[PDB]
Every structure is written in structure tokens, then in C-alpha cells.
């Protein structure tokens, strides 16, 4: 059906259509042990879909996929909430597009329905082979699509493959103004034939339509990489700072990926079996070896380092020019007789010819080191190193090791880093070492991620959330990926930008990984 | 016409008396007090443009009548007046939120409430019904009420020159609106019209200089913030830090402190400001007198801009000397802190006894930048 | 109505009755904007009530209240889950008692319905004035009570006061066997007249009927009191170890109560403005003062210590005989020149005549301390002190301070403590201090409580949860209070008992604070 | 009543309305010694009012009063001329606004009727309380 209206002033019209490019199959539910009805008011409540919205500009090419949504109870808030109580479901959905159009100049949209186990093409030409509808920007207000439930079974259990709706640009947008854009918004509600089947206790790990984040300012989150210095600032660096293998790597697949843990307090202490021998070059250095509790010394599959023991990094050409710092002490009955400051390398002096690695082979400036003795390691900071670049060195998984992979931000976006400051251990000694002030940056801390590790994440959607700080009102929108990096869209120069650390994170909506943020952080300073 | 939620009519059977309205108060072209807002290309999506409680305050006449009454029951009929144009596109969302439910801060969540999507092309005379949601027979005052919320669903864009859209809202009560229990009109329900007596600014007092008359008004683009304590007021008091309704009497104070001096100058004697009330110096009440000048900023001693004032040694209430003297506001330099109100004052006079009380009357600055420097007041402690 | 059956063997009967000691009022819902129906299968699903069960023994006196449940949607799993989506409700519930009776010897039960805003008496004599039913242990199988919704409004919003059901012993139980007991179990389902009113988005902080706890072994939780030593053991001490004011105090009312925080890493560092003067007794000691960031130095309402800076305790008569340890260093431009070991008291030497306090006044063994100098404090351990008793000293809120209160376990139950071990800083010096190995115990760590800080807790119910460790199967049941202490029922001697720290917490049920655990930990060692 | 037309080229419409935000009272003239009729062609001759016109620009603020005309025989040329010959009068008038509008972009006008001995406000917000 169709319906046309005259706009105010009579300078155009707007259309509102209902279409069924129909598979159109209804199940009798003969094998369902019980058929569970719904509140009649759920069928009359059209809610925004997680995955919408998207914007169309003059630079948007045809053939690029703008939406890809599975037909399931997750399209509506109340069916998503209700579904946690049930075992199966059956029925189609009503999908409504809302086009903020005008008699701009021109352009067309195409929406198509795709059956399960069929690849989605990247051509507007091929989408016309599917059941579809076409729409014009000069007259489009709302298109309602009767999306069917395509299945070869009478009702669903969790884990099936489902049909999809795909939206694409059919003809490019045009207008006199270069800033004119068209925003598409999608809402959904179940069709009257929708039903649930079997009542079961709700799931505690339910992937819910709304994620609630308790008030916890960033400065309270501390710290996978420097767990002795409070977080006080948020950072935005624009030096192509793609994160190599670091600590604090958390994803909602595993918990902690790599040699990371949910208890990083201090700077995790480890010990070494300090055998030694001949050393060329430096005369004061001894080549010790690192022990591995909970990990066998002779298995490449597990990491050859204690869990939580990671960067401060090393391995640069100046690896022997720049030395790390540790509280070192010899092991004796009941504890450690003394705890002193010594220069440690944790690098690639002679034996490996490696880069920033994760041995299993650590070098020290101590000449007093003896073979038959265990020693303590509590890293503190740096000594003689540069700033802001030699802490974020680039290690990775070498050999047959399987660590966290290297990640980069998407084009047009940059990371945001939790930042802390390290004071300098300045000392006047006949024996002892100095230090240098340093800035330390870390990825998402487990205090905020652990909530996501429990609440859940819709599949294929990235969380969009705000950052509300001291009065007056100022909110910055970031995107929290399941892979565990929070990013922001930026414009301007490549300035290193500092953001406060007093504000609560607030969930806003579920968005696709490719979603342009309107709230940009103009890097001008 | 759209009714996102049905309006359940209540038979006021528990009401001691049912008071009827003038039948002509049901003319629906009276503006809604506060029901005005504009949209531009800069307005962000999800921004809240209007949040009105559904009460007799939605109409000019019910707001006047409600001062005579103790109770009320009924809903309202709203109408949208959109001064749109031919080149613009965008959408708004209007939602009804029940009494004891929080307003979300996402348009994604606002779609969970009963709502209507409004397009700028076809929304110039749309009618919305605002219902009365309650579990009681009628309302008293101090209740928790439902709300109407309007937000930007899709931002405003134009195919031509940029244009703003000003939107106004008019209302009239539904036929089931009623009042209850006549009471004298000195109640709450602030009046919908404020009558201001004609008093030019030159006839007003300057709380930060109550001896020089106001001469003009001015606007400065650099002054993006104000942190003053003197001369600040509020209607939803509450209170304001150290601001009086009698600024002239606020500008006299006394001081006293024992021997002492600043490091580089043995000519700057300490002095602790006395309180109009009495100590303890509790960290819950202002440390300085309720009346005091904020003529200072983050200045540091040493070739420094300073403050000028009168001083005089108290003499049994009798005769005391008075002469212009210098004065700096606190040793903020010696504490690693910016200039703040809790620092003890200094007076550039070695001739001062240590057990005496000295008067203070701020009147100017010396060797200092003009307004740009006294515009920024000292800091606080929290 | 009533129904009687003959038991197998014909040595008795069992009764099953339905009764309505009835208020019996039904609402027309005339003022509800919309009436929201329910799935018809929810009315036919009787689920256990959170708050049941309870056991009756020969030692149970009449007049003691065994159950006290409000009539609300929280009695059933599916109405509790559904209610998060709605604004109001209206209707009564069906409550079913299940008595595991026999022709034991004798005894009777009484169940009564109580209107809102009426106090519950502690006499079986007075409960007979309320509408009630009486029941006999020789023939009772199930009693179904039609509990009405007593209200003066047409439908409810969250926050009202509700009617109650109270169960009590009317005549004491008797039998030949001294071990015979009767277990009462309660289930509920809504009556057909039950309805919801208005659809609203679900609450992210919803108090849900099921709490899901992600797998996180105790050793990963570390540590409000010693955040540099991994948790490796669980402890049960029976020396009347009622916890005085400690750190790691978390409740689901506030988050962290007292000067506790969700980021306790390291051993929170603080600094002191080390003024000094004359000191009697010790000639090497100087009386320094503690600074307070984020807290004014001149306000009793806030604590006079940095947040997170707390015990190691002090203040005992041997407070000057037993000294604490800290990494101390003087403050200079860019950091600290040196970081050394010094003996610190943090006690009541001369100036206070206090006990373990939380000044604002700290004493050191350093003679080199100078007035115009900031110094660092990183507590490590003890020196010259006893073990297992001088770390759990008894401080509290003195003066006008408002800190966390002192708590004790209920009669018959004892605390369970997260425990860690501190190595000894042994050193051979001409200047420097030694240490002693110590055991450190802490209350609930924020890693596991933070889940409860988000999921929610039914009001008046304490969580009962298990502890599943390495194979083969061994599970220990503990009770997690909202006040933030986990306790276990114990029998036997007062042995200090050690439990492993490798096992995931598993939620079991909601129980009342007075609930005897059947899985006891017999302290025999 | 209302009436709508399509402009030449069909790029807009124009409206012509008749409205009575009505007090609407008619006198029987029972105490008039004689009732004096008018030429029937005077009722069919719409003449410009002295006091019109006025122009609206982008700089014109709401709340400023642009017209204020008393309802009397002076609104029409022929009743103004005739009235010099008479002692009294009774009856209402038809007032017609002519707007030289276009689909320019936007804007609105408000016209209100005000009874005698009532002050005219300086707010567009308050004019909505009058019939308009």
C-alpha cells in the first residue's frame, strides 16, 4: 500500500509505503510443547534498532553496505528482554525506515532481504536480484518492510543462521549545498504471528539490550601497566600509536588475553635463577634466567614469563644505552635480606639478537650477582631513557608463541589512553642508581571492562558511550570495542591531547564498528 | 491528532468539592509558558529541547486559577506551531514519561516510551494529547507528575542557505479537567506573568563597588567564566557565598594578628580578618566577613601589583587615624597555592601594633592592569 | 476446600487444603492508562520463594518468627523478571507451604496475614488475632493460601508498603528420635487477576531474581589490605575475630565505606609535612604530620587520612616496642632522590594517649628528618612484632569521625578471610632495618563485590553461594551479607583453619540472615 | 471559512480565510429615536485604512506593536464622511489584511482583538490570551 501527503507550503510531497517483498511463510507450531503469547502492547511499540543509524553524504558510493541486520528478537527492546526467559521463538518482524529527506536534488536507496547462508554482495546491480524496494530522496518519509522469518524448522533455538536486511545507496546523493546530508533511522516491532515457546529461568550472563555502568571515575581505575600510580589524565596521541603487544589486554571473549590478569597490583613481582657466565662489552653485567610459576619452563605454547610480568619494554638499538629499574634483593630463609635498586635490561644485549621480547632472559648491572641465588624483581621505571616513546616500544609474538595481536585504530579515528605519572627515584650515592620522570599509558583497565565481561555485547555492534565530567555540562562520545580499545574521532593537527579523568561512563547505544561520531575532538593545541 | 497514551478519566468521587472552569478557558491558542525553542544545524542529536511537567502550568489561565485551589485532575491538548521552510530536513521525537520513571539521556532509549516522530516537513499543526497518569482520584501539590520530552531525533540539514526553525507550543485543557478545594491565593505555582517595575540600571547598586554608580553595560568575549563570590544571587535559594542585600555595609572590616612579616620584605605585617560572627574558624562557614572585596587574582609577591585600602587603629570606639595604605591578599606564593580567600591579609605598614584592631576600606588598586586583572577573583577550598 | 489421602501402607493420612483468610479485594484498574496482560503459562508455574526454606526442630520455641515475606512480584521468578519492564502492578498471589511431615509425634504451625503498617508480634497468642490457619505435623502435606493485595490505591508504583505472610511454631515439635526435624518449603505463583500497567525500558541496575558471577578464583582477587601479595589461601580463625575498623570495607549501599577505594593497588602511597620538635624517651624520633589530598586538613567530618591509607595497625601497649616498615624518601624536583627503609609507628607514642587511631600524626625512627621537606610513605610490613594478632589490631571511629562500624559474626557462625603472605626484608647493614614474615587477612575484595554492586540484592535476603574447587567435587557453602562479610557455620574446636583459593563462586539461593547452613566446616585440626 | 488556490506554475499555494474571534453582539437599537440606513453600495466598497501600511523585515522583533486601530466609522472613507452628518452610530466592521507573501522561508503573524479599557501588551506570548 501507499500514502501521500502535501508538505507545508505545498513545495513537495512525502510518501509512506508498506511493502512485502515476500518470502511470507507462517508456522503452525505443531511440535511446540507450549505456545507462549505476548503482551498485546508489545506489538504496538516501535523501538529503535541497535545498529541504526547511518548517514548518507555526497561522498557515499553505491555498492557499499550501510546496514546488515539479522531478523531476530534482538531487533526490539521488549522481545530482546523477553527472550531471556524462553527457549525458542518463531515469527517475523516489521522494519521501518525513516528518511530525513527533502527535494534536495536527487538520489535513491535500495533495501533488500537476503535468505540464510547466502553471501551479501557489494554491488547495487546484484542487490536487484534479491527481493527489494527502491526509494527516492525527494519524496521518502517512511518505508515499512514486512520482514519474514525464513526457516526450514517450525521454531528456533539459539544458535541458528537467520535472514538479513541490507540497505545500500542505489544512486548518489546530490544538492547545491555541500553540507546537506540524509540521515536514515530504523525501528522495529514484532508481527502479530510472533510467538515464544518454552518458559525457562532467566540467564545470568544474558546479552541484554541495555548495559548499565556503575559510577566509577577513571582515576579509580588503576592499572594493568603501572599499578602504583593513580590514573589522573586521559590521553590522545596522534603519532600513529598503534598498540603493539601490551599488558592490560582484555576482550569479551576470554577475559585477559596474553599474560595479563585481573589482579595486576603493584608491578607484579617475579624472581630469577641467576646463573651467569662470560659477557662481552660490559664487564659488570650477568646473564640471569627467569623462572615461570604455573607455566612449564619447557613448553612454547604457554608464554615464557610469569603472568602479569610484561613491559616496561626494551630491545631498541639503545636497549643497552637505556636501562630499566627494579627493586632487587637476594632470597634467603624467610624472605629477602635486602631490597636495593639495580639497573635491569630485559632486552636483547647479546644472546638473542631479538627486539622487545618476552624472555626468559634478563640482564642486570649487578656484579655481586651469584649463581646459586634467587633474586627479586619489582620494576619501578627508567634510567637514562627518552620520554613518551621508549615505554611504548613495539614487541609482538615471536616464534611459536600465541599472544595478543597488534591492533590499530580505524581510518579517521584514534585511541584514547589511560595515563599515569611516575615520580623520579633521585638519589646521591657511592652505589645506587638515579631515575627519570616518565609518562605511562595503558589500555582498558579491568575495573570498567569487567562489567562488559558480565553484562554482554550484541554481536557485530560496538558500544557507544559518553563521558560526563564536572559541571558545567561537557560530554565526549567514545566507542568501546569488544577487542578492548576505546577510540574517538578526531580532526585537526596531530597534537598530543590531554582529557580529564573525573567523569562517569554512560552507555548510549549500540553502533556498528564503522560509525562516524558527530562529537569530534578538534586537536588544535 | 495523536494520543501515544490513552487518557483515563477520573470521576472525582473522593473530592469534597468539584469546581468547574469557565467554559471559554477551552480555547486552544494560548501559548505554553516555556514551550518555545529553536533548532539549528549545530544542535546535536539526542539533545533535549523541552521537558515540561504535565500540570496546570501548561496553560496561561489554568496557571492563574491554580493559585486559588488545592487540587486538580485532567490532561491537556497541545498544538505545534513550526515556522519551517522549503529547504530543511530533520525529525523530532516527543515522548510521555510516567511519574516515577527517570528520563533517559539517549534517543535510542526514548523510543521505549510512547512517542511520536515529527518531520519538519509535515508538522506545522500537529496535535498531541498530554495525559494525566496517576493512581489516585486527584492531585495535591508536591506530587510526582508525568513529563513531556522533546528531543532531536535526526539533525537539521538544508539543501540551501542555513535556516533556523523556531517552534512554539500552544495548549488548552481537555474537557475532563477540574479543580478542587478553594484556598486563598498566596500559594505556590509561580505566576505565568512577571511584572517588572521600571528601574534603570543607573539607579541600581554595584555590589563590587557600592560607591561608584553603574554607568553602563558591556559585553566581553574573553570573559567566558565568572567565579566571583560578592554580588551573586539566586531565586532558588539556597544561598550564595558572601553576598549581601546591603552591599554598602559589607565594605568595612577589622583585622588583627601578632608579630610577623613576609620573607623578602619586613614591611608587610600579617593580619587575620575578623568575622562578623565569632569563631571557631569552622571549615563550614566563610572564612572572610560576609562583606568583602574580590579585587584580586593569582598575583605573587615581588615587584607585584597590589591592593589599596584605608586603615586605622581602633581606639575604644573613639578617634582613630586613617590614611591610604597598601594591601595584598594572602601569601599564596609561599604555599604553592593560587590566591584564595582563606589566606590572611598583609598591610604595607611597619607602624602597626600587634595586639591592635585595624579598619579596612578597599577603594582601588595600584601598579596593576585594568579590569582584565580584577575580573578574575581568588580561588576557594571546596 | 480440603483433600485427604491415605499413605502407602495405610499408617496415616496426608491433607492438602486451600484457604483464604481473606481480605479479598479486587481492583477495577479504572485509572490505569493501559492494562498489560501476562503469558498464560506464568499463572501455572509455582516456583520457590527467595526467603524459604526453614527447618523446625525440638529446640524451636513458639513465638519466634520463621518467615516474613512481602506480597509482591518478587515472590515468583517470572513476575520478578517481568516487573523490570513495567511501571506498576496490581493483584494477589498464591502461596503454598510444603511440610515434610509424618506421624512423628506432635506439633502445630500457624500462618497469618498482616496488613501494611502493622507491627509483627513475637507471640503465637497474638498471631491468632490476625486472619490465619493452623496446621498439624502428623497430617500436613501442603497448605495453599490465597494471599490478597491489600492497598488503598488502584495499582502500585515501586516504593509502597505491602502486606506480609508470617509463619510461626504454634506447638513445639516432639518425637522419640532426637534427630527428627521438619523442613518447610514455600512456593508461589500469581493469581489470575494479577496485571501490570505500563511498558518502560528495562532497568540496568535491576534487582534481579538471579545473580550471575563470572569465573574468577580467589587468588585473582588482590587486595584492599596487602595489594602486593597474591591471595593464596582462605582462612577461618576462631579467636572471636570480630572485625574492627579495617580497609576493604565494601557494602551494597555506598560502594566503599570508610577510607577505602576500588583501586587499592600497591600499598597506597602518601606523604608527610615532616615538622618536628622535642621528643621524650626515644632520642632518634621525630613527630611528623600527614597531608590530606582531596580532604581538608580542618574538617572532622572527612577522615584525616588519605583515601586508601589505613592499617597496618598500631597503638597497642607494645606500639613503641613494635614498629612498622615503610619505603621512605625525601621529595625533590622531579621525584625522590632516594627511597630507603625506615621504622614507622603510625601510633600513639606521646601526643595522643590514643589507641590504634587514624591520624594525621605519624612517628619515625629517622634522625635525619628535617622540617622543610616532604617525604614518601609506602608501608611494607612489620619489625619486631608478634604474628597473627598485631596486624588485626582493634581501631574504630574516635571523636566526631564517621567511619565503617565494627561488626561481628552471628552466634554459631564465623568469618572467612582472604589471606596473603608477606616475605621478610632481611638485610645486613650498618644502617637499615630488618623485617619479619607475617600473615595478612582482608575482608571482601572489590573484584567479587563489584558484581553485587551492579546486579543487586533482594532486600532482607542474604546470598547463599558455593565454592567449587579442583576435582574431585568439593563444595563449601558460605553466606555473603550485603554488609560485606562472608561467613560459614562451624563446629568443633577453635582451630585456625586454612581453605584453598582455587575455585569459582557460584550463586545458589537467597536466604534470610538467620539461616542455618547444613554444610558445616568441622574444625578438628 | 477558508479557501485555497494554486499559484501559477504550481510552486506553492495561497490562502484566503474569514474568521470571527468573536465577541459578536448585536444591538436592537430600541432607544434610538430614529434608525438611519445607508446606501447599499457602501457595504461593498473596501477602502484602505488610515494607519496602514507597515513593512516586515528580518530586523523586526516579535512583541513590537505594528498596528493599533480603533473600531469606528473612521476606518472607511464613506462612513467617515457620512458620520459628520449624524449624532450616533452602532455596528461592527470588516477588516481585511493583505499579505504580499511568498514561500520566502518562514515567519508568522498574529492579529488580536482587544476590548475597551484594556492595556495592549508588548509580548507576542500575551497576545495569545486575547481572541486572535
Residue A75 Cα to chain centre, angstroms? 22
E strand spans, B174-225: 178-180
Q: Tell me chain B's radius of gyration from C-alpha atoms.
A: 30
The length of chain D is 132
Cα four-point dihedral sign C379, C380, C382, C383: negative
Element (H, E) at D14: strand D13-15
**Secondary structure of residue C464 in the 3-state scheme:** strand
Q: Distance between CA C133 and CA C166 in Å, rounded?
A: 11
For residue B35, give the H/E element and its range. Answer: strand B30-39
H or E element: which one contains A256?
A: strand A255-256
**Under an 8 A CB cutoff, do A177 and B159 touch?**
yes
Residue B344 near chain A (CB below 8 Å):
no
Contact across the interface for B113 and C201, Cβ inside 8 Å: yes
- Is the CB of residue B286 less than 8 Å away from at least one CB of chain C? no
- Calculate the alpha carbon distances from C81 to B275, C76, C84, C451, C460 in Å: 59, 9, 6, 18, 19
Please, are residues A391 and A382 in contact by the beta-carbon 8 Å criterion?
yes
Cis ω for the linkage preceding A136 (within 30 of 0)? no
Kindly report the three-state secondary structure assignment for every residue of C401-412. Answer: CCCCCCCCCCCC
- Does B14 lie at the interface with A, CB-CB under 8 angstroms? no
d(CA A142, CA B91): 12
The answer, for D105 touching chain B at a CB cutoff of 8 Å, is yes
Nearest residue on chain C to B98, alpha-carbon basis? C87
- Eight-class DSSP state of B19: B
Q: Which residues of C277-315 are buried (b: 16+ CB within 10 A; e: fewer)?
A: eeeeeeeebbbbebebeeeeeeeeebbbbbbbbbbbbbb
Nearest-angstrom CA–CA distance, B267 and B348: 6
Tell me the HSE value of B218 on the side-chain side, using a 13 A CA sphere.
8
Find the closest chain B residue to C30 by CA distance.
Answer: B8
Residue C131 CA to residue C133 CA, distance in Å, equals 7
d(CA C378, CA C391): 16
Show which subunits contact B, needing at least 3 CB pairs below 8 angstroms: A, C, D
Method of determination is cryo-EM
Q: Is the dihedral of CA B79, B84, B89, B90 positive or negative?
A: negative
Please provide the DSSP assignment of D21-35 as one string: ---------TT-S--
- What is the C-alpha separation between C516 and C513, in angstroms, rounded? 9
Helix (H, G, I), strand (E, B) or coil at C511: strand
The C-alpha atoms of residue B36 and residue B83 are separated, in whole angstroms, by 12
Q: Rounded to whole angstroms, how far apart are CA atoms B141 and A349?
A: 79
Reference B86, options D106, A31, C423; nearest CA is: D106
Pairing type for strands A106-114 and A132-136 reads antiparallel
Q: Which residues of A387-398 are buried (b: 16+ CB within 10 A; e: fewer)?
A: eeebbbbebeee
The secondary structure of B285-307 as a DSSP string is S-SS-SS------S--SSS--EE
Q: Please give the Cα distance from C485 to C483 (Å, whole number).
A: 6
Q: What is the spatial distance between Cα A260 and Cα A252, in angstroms, rounded to a whole number?
A: 14
Closest alpha carbon within chain C to A84: C81
Distance CA C435, CA C437 (A): 7
**Whole-angstrom Cα distance, residue A435 to residue A421?**
13
Among the partner residues B8, B101, B283, nearest to C200 by beta-carbon distance? B101
Mark yes or no for CB contact A39/C36 under 8 Å: yes
Chains that touch D (3 or more CB pairs under 8 A): A, B
Å between A12 CA and nearest CA of chain D? 9
Identify all chain D residues contacting A9, using CB atoms and an 8 Å cutoff. Answer: 12-13, 103
Pairing of strands A250-251, A255-256: antiparallel
Are C37 and A36 in contact (CB < 8 Å)? no
- 3-class secondary structure, D10: coil
User: Do D and C share at least 3 CB pairs under 8 Å?
Assistant: no
Neighbours of B44 (CB within 10 A): 11
Interchain CB contact of C429 with A (< 8 Å): yes
Q: Is-cis flag, bond preceding A243, omega within 30?
A: no
Kind plus residue range of the DSSP H or E element containing C452:
helix C446-455
H-only helix segments in A62-178: 77-83, 124-127
Helix H or strand E segment including B64:
helix B60-65
Q: Which strand (E) or helix (H) includes residue C147?
A: strand C140-147
CB atoms < 10 A from the CB of B237, how many?
A: 7
The torsion angles phi and psi of B187, rounded to 5 degrees, stand at -80, -170
Contacts of C267 (CB under 8 A, 6+ apart): C226, C227, C228, C378, C379, C380
- Chain A residues touching residue B158 (CB < 8 angstroms): 177, 179-180
With an 8 Å Cβ cutoff, is A511 touching chain B? no
- The candidate with the shortest Cα–Cα distance to A418, out of A216, A249, A221, is A221
CB distance B244 to B207 below 8 Å: yes
Work out the angle between the directed axes of helices A446-455 and C446-455 (0-180°, nearest 10): 50
In this complex, the residue of B31, B87, B165 whose CB is nearest that of residue D125 is B31
Number of CB atoms found within 10 A of residue C245's CB: 24
Contacts of B313 (CB under 8 A, 6+ apart): B320, B321, B352, B353, B356, B357, B358
Residue numbers in A near B106 (CB within 8 A): 507-509
List, in order, residues 6 or more apart from B225 with CB less than 8 Å away.
Answer: none
Q: How far apart are CA A153 and CA A89, in angstroms?
A: 11
Q: Which residue of C has its CA nearest to A42?
A: C199
CB contact under 8 A, C153 and B133: no
Q: Is B336 on the interface with C (CB under 8 A)?
A: no
Which chain C residues have a beta carbon less than 8 Å from that of A204? Answer: 210-213, 507
Helices in C89-159 by DSSP H: which ranges?
Answer: 124-127
Contact A405, A395 (CB under 8 A): no
Query: From the CA of B5, how many Å to the nearest CA of chain A?
Result: 11
Residue A315 CB: number of other CB atoms within 10 A? Answer: 19
CA-closest candidate to residue C271, choices C249, C304, C293: C293
DSSP category for residue C86: B
Report the SS3 class of residue C455: helix
d(CA C73, CA C299): 46
Pairing, β C424-425 against β A335-336? parallel
- Measured in degrees and rounded to the nearest 5, phi and psi for residue A125 equal -60, -45
Residues 6+ apart with CB under 8 A from A59: none
With beta carbons less than 8 A apart as the criterion, state whether A336 and A376 touch: yes
B104 contacts C87? CB cut-off 8 A: no
The reply to whether D128 touches chain B by the CB within 8 Å rule is yes
Contact B8/C at CB under 8 A: yes
C124 phi and psi, to 5 degrees?
-65, -30
Mutate to test the interface with B, among C29, C84, C200 (most CBs of B within 10 A): C200
Lateral strand order in the sheet of A65-70: A65-70, A164-174, A106-114, A132-136
Among C73, C108, C107, C113, which Cα is nearest to C93's?
Answer: C73
The residues near B279 (Cβ < 8 Å, ≥ 6 apart) are: none
What contacts C262, CB < 8 A, 6 or more positions away? A216, A220, A447, C255, C256, C446, C450
Exposed e or buried b for every residue in B294-320, given b needs 16+ CB within 10 A? Answer: bbbbebebeeebbbbbbbbeeeeeeee
3-state secondary structure of C435: coil
| Nearest-neighbour CA in chain A from C355: distance (Å) | 30
**C299 contacts on B by Cβ (under 8 Å):** 283-284
SS3 A41: helix
C87 reaches B (C-beta below 8 A): yes
Q: Which of A38, A201, A220 sits opposite C261 (nearest CB)?
A: A220
Amino acid at each position: 500500500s501507499s500514502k501521500t501527503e502535501q508538505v507545508t507550503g505545498a513545495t513537495g510531497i512525502t510518501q509512506s509505503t508498506v511493502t512485502a517483498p515476500l518470502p511470507e511463510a507462517v508456522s503452525s507450531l505443531s511440535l511446540a510443547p507450549t505456545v507462549n503469547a505476548l503482551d498485546p502492547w508489545v506489538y504496538l511499540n516501535q523501538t529503535e534498532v541497535p545498529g541504526g543509524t547511518f548517514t548518507v553524504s555526497s561522498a557515499t558510493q553505491p555498492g557499499s553496505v550501510l546496514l546488515e541486520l539479522e531478523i531476530s528478537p534482538e531487533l526490539n527492546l521488549y522481545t530482546s528482554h523477553l527472550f531471556r526467559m524462553y527457549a525458542g521463538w518463531s515469527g517475523g518482524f516489521s522494519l521501518k525506515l525513516l528518511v530525513a529527506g527533502n527535494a534536495f536534488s536527487a538520489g535513491k536507496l535500495i533495501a533488500a532481504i537476503i535468505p540464510p547462508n547466502i553471501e551479501v554482495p557489494n554491488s547495487a546491480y546484484l542487490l536487484t536480484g534479491f527481493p527489494h524496494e527502491i526509494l527516492d530522496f525527494r519524496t521518502a518519509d517512511s518505508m515499512e518492510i514486512i520482514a519474514p522469518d525464513i526457516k526450514n524448522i517450525d521454531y528456533h533455538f539459539r544458535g541458528d543462521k537467520l535472514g538479513k536486511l541490507v540497505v545500500m545507496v542505489y544512486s548518489p546523493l546530490r544538492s547545491t549545498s555541500a553540507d546537506f546530508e540524509i540521515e536514515i533511522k530504523l525501528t522495529s516491532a514484532p508481527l502479530p504471528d510472533f510467538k515464544f515457546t518454552m518458559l525457562v529461568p532467566p540467564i545470568q550472563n544474558n546479552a541484554l539490550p541495555i548495559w548499565s555502568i556503575p559510577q566509577a571515575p577513571p582515576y579509580s581505575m588503576v592499572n594493568p601497566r603501572s599499578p602504583l600510580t593513580p590514573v589522573v589524565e586521559l590521553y590522545i596521541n596522534s603519532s600513529y600509536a598503534t598498540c603493539n603487544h601490551q599488558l592490560g589486554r582484555y576482550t569479551i571473549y576470554q577475559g585477559a588475553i596474553g599474560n595479563s590478569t585481573f589482579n595486576p597490583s603493584g608491578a607484579w613481582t617475579a624472581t630469577c635463577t641467576a646463573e651467569a657466565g662470560s659477557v662481552t662489552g660490559h664487564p659488570n653485567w650477568r646473564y640471569a634466567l627467569l623462572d615461570l610459576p604455573d607455566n612449564p619452563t619447557f613448553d612454547p605454547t604457554l608464554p615464557p614469563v610469569p603472568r602479569g610480568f610484561c613491559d616496561w619494554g626494551s630491545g631498541v638499538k639503545s636497549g643497552n644505552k637505556q636501562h630499566l629499574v627494579c627493586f632487587t634483593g637476594k632470597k634467603v630463609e624467610g624472605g629477602f635480606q635486602d631490597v636495593d635498586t639495580h639497573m635491569w635490561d630485559y632486552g636483547d644485549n647479546e644472546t638473542v639478537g631479538l627486539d622487545n621480547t618476552y624472555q626468559r632472559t634478563i640482564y642486570i648491572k649487578d656484579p655481586s650477582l651469584e649463581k646459586d641465588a634467587q633474586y627479586l624483581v619489582i620494576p619501578m621505571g627508567v634510567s637514562g631513557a627518552a620520554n613518551d616513546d621508549t615505554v611504548q616500544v613495539a614487541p609482538n609474538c615471536y616464534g611459536s608463541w600465541d599472544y595478543a595481536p597488534t591492533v590499530a585504530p580505524p581510518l579517521g579515528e584514534q585511541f584514547v589512553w589511560f595515563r599515569s605519572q611516575l615520580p623520579a627515584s633521585k638519589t646521591t650515592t657511592t652505589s645506587g642508581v638515579n631515575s627519570v620522570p616518565v609518562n605511562v599509558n595503558a589500555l582498558m583497565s579491568p575495573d570498567l571492562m569487567c562489567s562488559a565481561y558480565a553484562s554482554g555485547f550484541p554481536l557485530g555492534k560496538v558500544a557507544l558511550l559518553d563521558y560526563v565530567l564536572f559541571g558545567g555540562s561537557v560530554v565526549r562520545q567514545f566507542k568501546l570495542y569488544p577487542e578492548g580499545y576505546m577510540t574517538a574521532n578526531t580532526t585537526g593537527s596531530n597534537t598530543g591531547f590531554i582529557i580529564p579523568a573525573d567523569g562517569y561512563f554512560r552507555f548510549n547505544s549500540w553502533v556498528s564498528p564503522s560509525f562516524m561520531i558527530s562529537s569530534v575532538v578538534d586537536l588544535n593545541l
